[PDB]
PDB file of all heavy atoms in Angstrom:
ATOM      1  N   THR A 363      72.974 183.804 176.083  1.00 22.81           N
ATOM      2  CA  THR A 363      73.780 183.717 174.888  1.00 22.81           C
ATOM      3  C   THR A 363      74.311 182.296 174.793  1.00 22.81           C
ATOM      4  O   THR A 363      74.067 181.478 175.674  1.00 22.81           O
ATOM      5  CB  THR A 363      74.906 184.756 174.844  1.00 22.81           C
ATOM      6  OG1 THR A 363      75.546 184.692 173.559  1.00 22.81           O
ATOM      7  CG2 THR A 363      75.924 184.516 175.944  1.00 22.81           C
ATOM      8  N   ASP A 364      75.003 181.990 173.709  1.00 21.40           N
ATOM      9  CA  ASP A 364      75.399 180.615 173.463  1.00 21.40           C
ATOM     10  C   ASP A 364      76.585 180.305 174.328  1.00 21.40           C
ATOM     11  O   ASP A 364      77.408 181.182 174.608  1.00 21.40           O
ATOM     12  CB  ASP A 364      75.708 180.358 171.986  1.00 21.40           C
ATOM     13  CG  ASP A 364      76.890 179.397 171.793  1.00 21.40           C
ATOM     14  OD1 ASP A 364      76.722 178.170 172.056  1.00 21.40           O
ATOM     15  OD2 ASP A 364      77.991 179.874 171.390  1.00 21.40           O
ATOM     16  N   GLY A 365      76.632 179.050 174.766  1.00 19.90           N
ATOM     17  CA  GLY A 365      77.672 178.560 175.663  1.00 19.90           C
ATOM     18  C   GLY A 365      77.433 178.956 177.106  1.00 19.90           C
ATOM     19  O   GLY A 365      78.338 178.811 177.942  1.00 19.90           O
ATOM     20  N   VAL A 366      76.238 179.467 177.410  1.00 24.03           N
ATOM     21  CA  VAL A 366      75.908 179.812 178.786  1.00 24.03           C
ATOM     22  C   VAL A 366      75.399 178.575 179.521  1.00 24.03           C
ATOM     23  O   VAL A 366      74.629 177.793 178.983  1.00 24.03           O
ATOM     24  CB  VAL A 366      74.927 181.015 178.894  1.00 24.03           C
ATOM     25  CG1 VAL A 366      74.111 180.961 180.165  1.00 24.03           C
ATOM     26  CG2 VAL A 366      75.692 182.318 178.885  1.00 24.03           C
ATOM     27  N   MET A 367      75.842 178.405 180.756  1.00 26.39           N
ATOM     28  CA  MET A 367      75.392 177.286 181.540  1.00 26.39           C
ATOM     29  C   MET A 367      74.086 177.580 182.287  1.00 26.39           C
ATOM     30  O   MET A 367      74.001 178.546 183.043  1.00 26.39           O
ATOM     31  CB  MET A 367      76.506 176.868 182.482  1.00 26.39           C
ATOM     32  CG  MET A 367      77.463 175.863 181.848  1.00 26.39           C
ATOM     33  SD  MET A 367      78.264 174.787 183.247  1.00 26.39           S
ATOM     34  CE  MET A 367      79.369 176.233 184.031  1.00 26.39           C
ATOM     35  N   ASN A 368      73.074 176.742 182.067  1.00 24.31           N
ATOM     36  CA  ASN A 368      71.776 176.920 182.723  1.00 24.31           C
ATOM     37  C   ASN A 368      71.780 176.728 184.245  1.00 24.31           C
ATOM     38  O   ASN A 368      72.336 175.780 184.787  1.00 24.31           O
ATOM     39  CB  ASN A 368      70.679 176.067 182.070  1.00 24.31           C
ATOM     40  CG  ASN A 368      69.348 176.116 182.835  1.00 24.31           C
ATOM     41  OD1 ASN A 368      68.822 175.085 183.218  1.00 24.31           O
ATOM     42  ND2 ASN A 368      68.805 177.310 183.043  1.00 24.31           N
ATOM     43  N   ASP A 369      71.145 177.703 184.875  1.00 21.10           N
ATOM     44  CA  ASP A 369      70.909 177.899 186.280  1.00 21.10           C
ATOM     45  C   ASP A 369      70.230 176.718 186.954  1.00 21.10           C
ATOM     46  O   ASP A 369      70.441 176.452 188.138  1.00 21.10           O
ATOM     47  CB  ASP A 369      69.882 179.034 186.315  1.00 21.10           C
ATOM     48  CG  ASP A 369      70.297 180.179 187.178  1.00 21.10           C
ATOM     49  OD1 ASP A 369      70.743 179.945 188.313  1.00 21.10           O
ATOM     50  OD2 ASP A 369      70.154 181.331 186.733  1.00 21.10           O
ATOM     51  N   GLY A 370      69.371 176.042 186.192  1.00 21.41           N
ATOM     52  CA  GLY A 370      68.400 175.103 186.740  1.00 21.41           C
ATOM     53  C   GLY A 370      66.961 175.626 186.753  1.00 21.41           C
ATOM     54  O   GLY A 370      66.042 174.892 187.143  1.00 21.41           O
ATOM     55  N   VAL A 371      66.761 176.885 186.342  1.00 20.04           N
ATOM     56  CA  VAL A 371      65.426 177.473 186.295  1.00 20.04           C
ATOM     57  C   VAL A 371      64.844 177.229 184.915  1.00 20.04           C
ATOM     58  O   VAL A 371      65.555 177.281 183.918  1.00 20.04           O
ATOM     59  CB  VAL A 371      65.442 178.965 186.626  1.00 20.04           C
ATOM     60  CG1 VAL A 371      64.119 179.606 186.279  1.00 20.04           C
ATOM     61  CG2 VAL A 371      65.735 179.163 188.091  1.00 20.04           C
ATOM     62  N   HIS A 372      63.553 176.942 184.869  1.00 23.03           N
ATOM     63  CA  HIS A 372      62.931 176.482 183.637  1.00 23.03           C
ATOM     64  C   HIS A 372      61.828 177.378 183.115  1.00 23.03           C
ATOM     65  O   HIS A 372      61.523 177.349 181.922  1.00 23.03           O
ATOM     66  CB  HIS A 372      62.415 175.052 183.809  1.00 23.03           C
ATOM     67  CG  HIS A 372      63.504 174.037 183.922  1.00 23.03           C
ATOM     68  ND1 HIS A 372      63.517 173.064 184.899  1.00 23.03           N
ATOM     69  CD2 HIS A 372      64.636 173.859 183.194  1.00 23.03           C
ATOM     70  CE1 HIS A 372      64.599 172.315 184.755  1.00 23.03           C
ATOM     71  NE2 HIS A 372      65.298 172.783 183.733  1.00 23.03           N
ATOM     72  N   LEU A 373      61.213 178.151 184.005  1.00 28.32           N
ATOM     73  CA  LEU A 373      60.197 179.100 183.603  1.00 28.32           C
ATOM     74  C   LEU A 373      60.618 180.492 184.005  1.00 28.32           C
ATOM     75  O   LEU A 373      61.464 180.676 184.898  1.00 28.32           O
ATOM     76  CB  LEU A 373      58.810 178.735 184.162  1.00 28.32           C
ATOM     77  CG  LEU A 373      58.419 177.246 184.101  1.00 28.32           C
ATOM     78  CD1 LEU A 373      58.412 176.701 185.492  1.00 28.32           C
ATOM     79  CD2 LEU A 373      57.087 176.992 183.476  1.00 28.32           C
ATOM     80  N   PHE A 374      60.027 181.470 183.328  1.00 27.21           N
ATOM     81  CA  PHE A 374      60.310 182.872 183.563  1.00 27.21           C
ATOM     82  C   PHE A 374      59.083 183.552 184.173  1.00 27.21           C
ATOM     83  O   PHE A 374      58.087 183.798 183.493  1.00 27.21           O
ATOM     84  CB  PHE A 374      60.669 183.506 182.243  1.00 27.21           C
ATOM     85  CG  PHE A 374      60.828 184.971 182.303  1.00 27.21           C
ATOM     86  CD1 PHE A 374      62.017 185.535 182.760  1.00 27.21           C
ATOM     87  CD2 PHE A 374      59.818 185.800 181.871  1.00 27.21           C
ATOM     88  CE1 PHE A 374      62.197 186.907 182.811  1.00 27.21           C
ATOM     89  CE2 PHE A 374      59.986 187.179 181.916  1.00 27.21           C
ATOM     90  CZ  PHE A 374      61.178 187.733 182.393  1.00 27.21           C
ATOM     91  N   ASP A 375      59.160 183.821 185.469  1.00 27.67           N
ATOM     92  CA  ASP A 375      58.105 184.530 186.208  1.00 27.67           C
ATOM     93  C   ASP A 375      58.559 184.853 187.623  1.00 27.67           C
ATOM     94  O   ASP A 375      59.640 184.459 188.028  1.00 27.67           O
ATOM     95  CB  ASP A 375      56.849 183.695 186.286  1.00 27.67           C
ATOM     96  CG  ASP A 375      57.026 182.510 187.145  1.00 27.67           C
ATOM     97  OD1 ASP A 375      57.201 182.662 188.365  1.00 27.67           O
ATOM     98  OD2 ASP A 375      57.006 181.407 186.597  1.00 27.67           O
ATOM     99  N   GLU A 376      57.712 185.519 188.393  1.00 25.28           N
ATOM    100  CA  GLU A 376      58.136 186.114 189.664  1.00 25.28           C
ATOM    101  C   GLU A 376      58.608 185.089 190.724  1.00 25.28           C
ATOM    102  O   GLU A 376      59.575 185.342 191.453  1.00 25.28           O
ATOM    103  CB  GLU A 376      57.060 187.065 190.224  1.00 25.28           C
ATOM    104  CG  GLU A 376      56.520 188.104 189.237  1.00 25.28           C
ATOM    105  CD  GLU A 376      55.456 187.512 188.307  1.00 25.28           C
ATOM    106  OE1 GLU A 376      55.208 186.290 188.398  1.00 25.28           O
ATOM    107  OE2 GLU A 376      54.854 188.259 187.498  1.00 25.28           O
ATOM    108  N   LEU A 377      57.918 183.948 190.783  1.00 24.12           N
ATOM    109  CA  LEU A 377      58.253 182.831 191.670  1.00 24.12           C
ATOM    110  C   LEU A 377      59.380 181.975 191.149  1.00 24.12           C
ATOM    111  O   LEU A 377      60.375 181.766 191.837  1.00 24.12           O
ATOM    112  CB  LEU A 377      57.057 181.906 191.822  1.00 24.12           C
ATOM    113  CG  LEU A 377      56.199 182.009 193.070  1.00 24.12           C
ATOM    114  CD1 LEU A 377      55.873 183.482 193.435  1.00 24.12           C
ATOM    115  CD2 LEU A 377      54.914 181.162 192.846  1.00 24.12           C
ATOM    116  N   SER A 378      59.221 181.427 189.953  1.00 20.26           N
ATOM    117  CA  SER A 378      60.175 180.425 189.550  1.00 20.26           C
ATOM    118  C   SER A 378      61.540 181.053 189.341  1.00 20.26           C
ATOM    119  O   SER A 378      62.562 180.423 189.626  1.00 20.26           O
ATOM    120  CB  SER A 378      59.698 179.631 188.342  1.00 20.26           C
ATOM    121  OG  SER A 378      59.458 180.495 187.263  1.00 20.26           O
ATOM    122  N   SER A 379      61.555 182.308 188.907  1.00 21.49           N
ATOM    123  CA  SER A 379      62.824 183.003 188.685  1.00 21.49           C
ATOM    124  C   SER A 379      63.562 183.403 189.987  1.00 21.49           C
ATOM    125  O   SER A 379      64.757 183.719 189.970  1.00 21.49           O
ATOM    126  CB  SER A 379      62.646 184.173 187.715  1.00 21.49           C
ATOM    127  OG  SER A 379      62.397 183.699 186.387  1.00 21.49           O
ATOM    128  N   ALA A 380      62.869 183.329 191.120  1.00 22.36           N
ATOM    129  CA  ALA A 380      63.491 183.608 192.406  1.00 22.36           C
ATOM    130  C   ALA A 380      64.399 182.476 192.877  1.00 22.36           C
ATOM    131  O   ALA A 380      65.067 182.588 193.911  1.00 22.36           O
ATOM    132  CB  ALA A 380      62.462 183.896 193.417  1.00 22.36           C
ATOM    133  N   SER A 381      64.416 181.394 192.110  1.00 23.04           N
ATOM    134  CA  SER A 381      65.361 180.321 192.332  1.00 23.04           C
ATOM    135  C   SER A 381      66.584 180.515 191.476  1.00 23.04           C
ATOM    136  O   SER A 381      67.438 179.646 191.405  1.00 23.04           O
ATOM    137  CB  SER A 381      64.737 178.982 191.984  1.00 23.04           C
ATOM    138  OG  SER A 381      63.868 178.548 193.012  1.00 23.04           O
ATOM    139  N   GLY A 382      66.666 181.649 190.806  1.00 22.87           N
ATOM    140  CA  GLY A 382      67.819 181.928 189.965  1.00 22.87           C
ATOM    141  C   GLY A 382      69.093 182.212 190.752  1.00 22.87           C
ATOM    142  O   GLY A 382      69.038 182.649 191.911  1.00 22.87           O
ATOM    143  N   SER A 383      70.238 181.985 190.105  1.00 23.57           N
ATOM    144  CA  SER A 383      71.551 182.213 190.715  1.00 23.57           C
ATOM    145  C   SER A 383      71.854 183.679 190.853  1.00 23.57           C
ATOM    146  O   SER A 383      72.749 184.046 191.582  1.00 23.57           O
ATOM    147  CB  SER A 383      72.661 181.576 189.881  1.00 23.57           C
ATOM    148  OG  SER A 383      72.985 182.382 188.762  1.00 23.57           O
ATOM    149  N   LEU A 384      71.117 184.502 190.127  1.00 24.04           N
ATOM    150  CA  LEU A 384      71.376 185.927 190.061  1.00 24.04           C
ATOM    151  C   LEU A 384      70.527 186.719 191.035  1.00 24.04           C
ATOM    152  O   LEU A 384      69.321 186.537 191.143  1.00 24.04           O
ATOM    153  CB  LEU A 384      71.174 186.434 188.624  1.00 24.04           C
ATOM    154  CG  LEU A 384      72.388 186.635 187.697  1.00 24.04           C
ATOM    155  CD1 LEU A 384      73.624 185.784 188.075  1.00 24.04           C
ATOM    156  CD2 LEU A 384      71.994 186.386 186.255  1.00 24.04           C
ATOM    157  N   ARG A 385      71.197 187.586 191.769  1.00 23.52           N
ATOM    158  CA  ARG A 385      70.552 188.583 192.616  1.00 23.52           C
ATOM    159  C   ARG A 385      71.249 189.906 192.346  1.00 23.52           C
ATOM    160  O   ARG A 385      72.348 190.165 192.841  1.00 23.52           O
ATOM    161  CB  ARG A 385      70.664 188.214 194.095  1.00 23.52           C
ATOM    162  CG  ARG A 385      69.360 187.778 194.687  1.00 23.52           C
ATOM    163  CD  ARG A 385      69.396 186.348 195.083  1.00 23.52           C
ATOM    164  NE  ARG A 385      68.083 185.912 195.533  1.00 23.52           N
ATOM    165  CZ  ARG A 385      67.161 185.378 194.737  1.00 23.52           C
ATOM    166  NH1 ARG A 385      67.412 185.198 193.439  1.00 23.52           N
ATOM    167  NH2 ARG A 385      65.988 185.009 195.241  1.00 23.52           N
ATOM    168  N   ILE A 386      70.631 190.733 191.525  1.00 24.66           N
ATOM    169  CA  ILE A 386      71.363 191.853 191.004  1.00 24.66           C
ATOM    170  C   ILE A 386      70.618 193.155 191.118  1.00 24.66           C
ATOM    171  O   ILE A 386      69.504 193.218 191.643  1.00 24.66           O
ATOM    172  CB  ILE A 386      71.846 191.611 189.542  1.00 24.66           C
ATOM    173  CG1 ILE A 386      70.670 191.303 188.619  1.00 24.66           C
ATOM    174  CG2 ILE A 386      72.887 190.476 189.495  1.00 24.66           C
ATOM    175  CD1 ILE A 386      71.049 191.124 187.169  1.00 24.66           C
ATOM    176  N   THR A 387      71.273 194.182 190.593  1.00 26.11           N
ATOM    177  CA  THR A 387      70.855 195.558 190.695  1.00 26.11           C
ATOM    178  C   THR A 387      70.930 196.181 189.307  1.00 26.11           C
ATOM    179  O   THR A 387      71.819 195.838 188.542  1.00 26.11           O
ATOM    180  CB  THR A 387      71.781 196.281 191.706  1.00 26.11           C
ATOM    181  OG1 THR A 387      71.254 196.110 193.029  1.00 26.11           O
ATOM    182  CG2 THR A 387      71.955 197.773 191.398  1.00 26.11           C
ATOM    183  N   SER A 388      69.979 197.066 188.986  1.00 29.20           N
ATOM    184  CA  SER A 388      70.001 197.906 187.780  1.00 29.20           C
ATOM    185  C   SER A 388      71.405 198.076 187.243  1.00 29.20           C
ATOM    186  O   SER A 388      71.618 197.995 186.044  1.00 29.20           O
ATOM    187  CB  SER A 388      69.462 199.305 188.089  1.00 29.20           C
ATOM    188  OG  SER A 388      68.119 199.294 188.535  1.00 29.20           O
ATOM    189  N   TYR A 389      72.353 198.304 188.149  1.00 28.82           N
ATOM    190  CA  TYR A 389      73.735 198.642 187.808  1.00 28.82           C
ATOM    191  C   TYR A 389      74.612 197.473 187.347  1.00 28.82           C
ATOM    192  O   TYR A 389      75.536 197.663 186.553  1.00 28.82           O
ATOM    193  CB  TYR A 389      74.417 199.378 188.978  1.00 28.82           C
ATOM    194  CG  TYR A 389      75.259 200.531 188.505  1.00 28.82           C
ATOM    195  CD1 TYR A 389      74.650 201.715 188.064  1.00 28.82           C
ATOM    196  CD2 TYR A 389      76.663 200.439 188.458  1.00 28.82           C
ATOM    197  CE1 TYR A 389      75.413 202.798 187.589  1.00 28.82           C
ATOM    198  CE2 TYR A 389      77.449 201.528 187.985  1.00 28.82           C
ATOM    199  CZ  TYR A 389      76.806 202.705 187.553  1.00 28.82           C
ATOM    200  OH  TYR A 389      77.526 203.791 187.082  1.00 28.82           O
ATOM    201  N   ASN A 390      74.345 196.274 187.847  1.00 27.90           N
ATOM    202  CA  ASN A 390      75.143 195.109 187.462  1.00 27.90           C
ATOM    203  C   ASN A 390      74.760 194.578 186.090  1.00 27.90           C
ATOM    204  O   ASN A 390      75.498 193.789 185.494  1.00 27.90           O
ATOM    205  CB  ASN A 390      75.035 193.975 188.492  1.00 27.90           C
ATOM    206  CG  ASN A 390      75.113 194.468 189.921  1.00 27.90           C
ATOM    207  OD1 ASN A 390      74.103 194.484 190.638  1.00 27.90           O
ATOM    208  ND2 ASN A 390      76.308 194.882 190.346  1.00 27.90           N
ATOM    209  N   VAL A 391      73.609 195.010 185.597  1.00 28.01           N
ATOM    210  CA  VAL A 391      73.080 194.490 184.346  1.00 28.01           C
ATOM    211  C   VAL A 391      74.065 194.757 183.221  1.00 28.01           C
ATOM    212  O   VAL A 391      74.497 193.824 182.544  1.00 28.01           O
ATOM    213  CB  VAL A 391      71.674 195.049 184.048  1.00 28.01           C
ATOM    214  CG1 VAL A 391      71.206 194.655 182.663  1.00 28.01           C
ATOM    215  CG2 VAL A 391      70.700 194.554 185.091  1.00 28.01           C
ATOM    216  N   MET A 392      74.464 196.017 183.072  1.00 29.04           N
ATOM    217  CA  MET A 392      75.407 196.403 182.022  1.00 29.04           C
ATOM    218  C   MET A 392      76.764 195.689 182.090  1.00 29.04           C
ATOM    219  O   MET A 392      77.344 195.410 181.049  1.00 29.04           O
ATOM    220  CB  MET A 392      75.583 197.924 181.963  1.00 29.04           C
ATOM    221  CG  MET A 392      76.331 198.402 180.724  1.00 29.04           C
ATOM    222  SD  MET A 392      75.448 197.909 179.036  1.00 29.04           S
ATOM    223  CE  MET A 392      74.660 199.646 178.634  1.00 29.04           C
ATOM    224  N   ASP A 393      77.256 195.387 183.297  1.00 29.78           N
ATOM    225  CA  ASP A 393      78.493 194.587 183.478  1.00 29.78           C
ATOM    226  C   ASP A 393      78.323 193.130 183.039  1.00 29.78           C
ATOM    227  O   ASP A 393      79.080 192.640 182.195  1.00 29.78           O
ATOM    228  CB  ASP A 393      78.992 194.616 184.936  1.00 29.78           C
ATOM    229  CG  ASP A 393      79.468 195.999 185.381  1.00 29.78           C
ATOM    230  OD1 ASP A 393      80.068 196.735 184.556  1.00 29.78           O
ATOM    231  OD2 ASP A 393      79.232 196.349 186.566  1.00 29.78           O
ATOM    232  N   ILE A 394      77.341 192.438 183.611  1.00 33.00           N
ATOM    233  CA  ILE A 394      77.061 191.065 183.220  1.00 33.00           C
ATOM    234  C   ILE A 394      76.873 190.999 181.711  1.00 33.00           C
ATOM    235  O   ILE A 394      77.317 190.059 181.068  1.00 33.00           O
ATOM    236  CB  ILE A 394      75.819 190.522 183.940  1.00 33.00           C
ATOM    237  CG1 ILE A 394      76.134 190.270 185.409  1.00 33.00           C
ATOM    238  CG2 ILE A 394      75.325 189.244 183.291  1.00 33.00           C
ATOM    239  CD1 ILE A 394      74.932 190.278 186.297  1.00 33.00           C
ATOM    240  N   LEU A 395      76.231 192.015 181.148  1.00 36.59           N
ATOM    241  CA  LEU A 395      76.058 192.073 179.705  1.00 36.59           C
ATOM    242  C   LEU A 395      77.368 192.196 178.948  1.00 36.59           C
ATOM    243  O   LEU A 395      77.568 191.502 177.954  1.00 36.59           O
ATOM    244  CB  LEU A 395      75.084 193.173 179.287  1.00 36.59           C
ATOM    245  CG  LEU A 395      73.617 192.769 179.421  1.00 36.59           C
ATOM    246  CD1 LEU A 395      72.732 193.883 178.903  1.00 36.59           C
ATOM    247  CD2 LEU A 395      73.311 191.459 178.711  1.00 36.59           C
ATOM    248  N   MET A 396      78.275 193.047 179.419  1.00 40.20           N
ATOM    249  CA  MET A 396      79.573 193.163 178.753  1.00 40.20           C
ATOM    250  C   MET A 396      80.424 191.907 178.875  1.00 40.20           C
ATOM    251  O   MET A 396      81.208 191.620 177.979  1.00 40.20           O
ATOM    252  CB  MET A 396      80.338 194.419 179.181  1.00 40.20           C
ATOM    253  CG  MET A 396      80.317 195.522 178.107  1.00 40.20           C
ATOM    254  SD  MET A 396      80.072 197.369 178.792  1.00 40.20           S
ATOM    255  CE  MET A 396      81.509 197.409 180.175  1.00 40.20           C
TER     256      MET A 396
END
């Protein structure tokens, strides 16, 4: 969403996204979303 600070990740896929700041669970999705 707007005003979000970028992680440093540039592509979306199984490898490159594993450098993401997020390590989450089905359950945290709805919270981060709210």
